[PDB]
Structures are given as structure tokens and as C-alpha cells.
Symmetry: C3
């Protein structure tokens, strides 16, 4: 039904999530971005449980653009190994999908 | 045996509308559950410039057999012309939860 | 190994942090993002309920998914908590590498 995909990326703060989004959108590697602030991320680091504040990003693009988008985000992300995951979209409204493709 | 389940993404302009859209699709049994995350920000280009809106992220859970009708219903009552309507697959899940999800519809 | 994203909700911040802490300590997940301030609407026994919840998003591999859900369900206060798995078709290599290595 669609090659559109959603990319998950974790940002340390709103300002960072903000220009990462602005950046990829300007480059047209993403059609749109949703930012969900107020979260924390837990993970182990050197036998220690780390917790940090984060903003969950949800970007929309396609499989033909996924790699290019990931690299752009990677290059501008302050973290060394930021979370960059691609989730497949099995279906979507036709008008919304057309709008996303047109934006890319 | 359970029918394939999916997660639907949709965004509403405010909490009032989010709860309203959710309550309707749940009443019509087009979705088994809805999670609403307020305070989100939607960024996208429109007419050549970057737009930014405060929105509520909706995460609706239903089955592949209902997705179509769910999307149709959400779009029918949604405040704007072309709302976010994306369907993500659930390749695995707790059997009991998936059963409640299914029986719920 | 293919990785996946797991969605689970907790009735409160403490439960969410405790659930993430133990699955990570058990090395059944690489990381978990906790998002407070959410709401869950659903019908229960013919009634519309709206409960406060913290949205959890956990990252692990397809090899640990079954084990991760069992552990989360085991320690979760609810009898039948939301436990759903979504596939990841692609991802940054270094990140996917770390994710696997963390388990």
C-alpha cells in the first residue's frame, strides 16, 4: 500500500529536536516531524543504569529516502550513536500519503 | 486464533478533539483502545515555509479488518482536510492482550 | 539480529521506572523511553474508561521479544497489560550494533 515509513530518533532536548527536524525538512528528507517532549530514557552504561531527559521524535519519509534521512540526522545529532530506527507503514489514507510524497 | 493487530497514528489539534475522536471510534467499535499524548509538536512545510503546531498524538489499536473503517471514521470527523492517518503493523504481542483487543471489536 | 520496538503502558511513573529498570537489568531490553502525561481510553465491561498512563517504548531484538513480554507482564500490576511488538525494517548500523551488543 505504501513505501512511506516512520523513523524514530531520540533527542536530548527540544532545541536539538527542533533544528534536527527543521534541518531534515528543509533538505526535504522528511515530509513532517512530530516531537514528544517530557520523556526520559533509561539504558545501561558501564555496569551503571543511566537515565536522561529526552524528546521522542517521529519523522515520516519513504524507504527510498530512509538511508539519506538517517545519515542527515546522524551527521547533525550531538550524540555519537543516536537512536535511528525505521518502522514500516503498512497502510495510510491516500490523501495523506500523497501529501507526504509530494513533500519529499 | 486472533486477527492481526495494528497501531494507528493520528494527530489532533487539541485534547478536546482528541478525546472526542477517540470516544467516537471506540463507541463505533472501530478501535479497541486509544492512547493520547498531549503537548506534542508537529513540524512540516506548507506553502514554502516551516509550520509548527501544538498537537496531541493519538495511538489507536485495532485489527487489520477494521483499519480501513477506522481511518474512514477518523477522517470523516477530523477538523482538517488531510489528517495524519498511518497504520503500523504489530508483528507480535501478548496473547491475552491481543485476545482482549480482538474480542473488544 | 532484527530489532523491534515494544509498547507497554504503566499506571504510574514509579511503576514505569521499576519495569524498565528490571527488564534492562535482566538484559531483556537495550533501552526504554518513558513518556508521562498520557491517557488511555477504552471500553471495559460496557463502560468508557480513561486512565492516566506513562507510555513506554522499549528496544530489544526479535530473539528477546518473547522473554521481554513475559518479564514485563510478570512484574506489571495489571493482569493483562498492553504488550505490543512492532518490527524495525532498517536502522543505523552503529546503533543496531550497540543495541545487539547491549544484550
Amino acid at each position: 500500500n505504501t513505501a512511506v515509513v516512520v523513523v524514530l530518533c531520540t533527542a536530548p532536548d527540544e532545541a536539538t529536536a527542533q533544528d534536527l527536524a527543521a534541518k531534515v525538512l528543509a533538505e526535504k528528507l522528511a515530509a513532517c516531524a512530530t516531537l514528544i517532549p517530557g520523556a526520559t530514557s533509561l539504558y545501561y552504561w558501564e555496569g551503571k543504569l543511566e537515565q536522561e531527559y529526552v524528546v521522542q521524535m517521529i519523522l515520516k519519509t519513504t524507504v527510498s529516502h530512509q538511508q539519506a534521512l538517517l545519515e542527515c540526522l546522524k551527521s547533525h545529532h550531538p550524540y555519537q550513536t543516536p537512536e535511528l530506527l525505521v518502522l514500516p507503514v503498512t497502510h495510510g489514507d491516500t490523501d495523506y500519503l500523497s501529501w507526504l510524497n509530494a513533500s519529499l
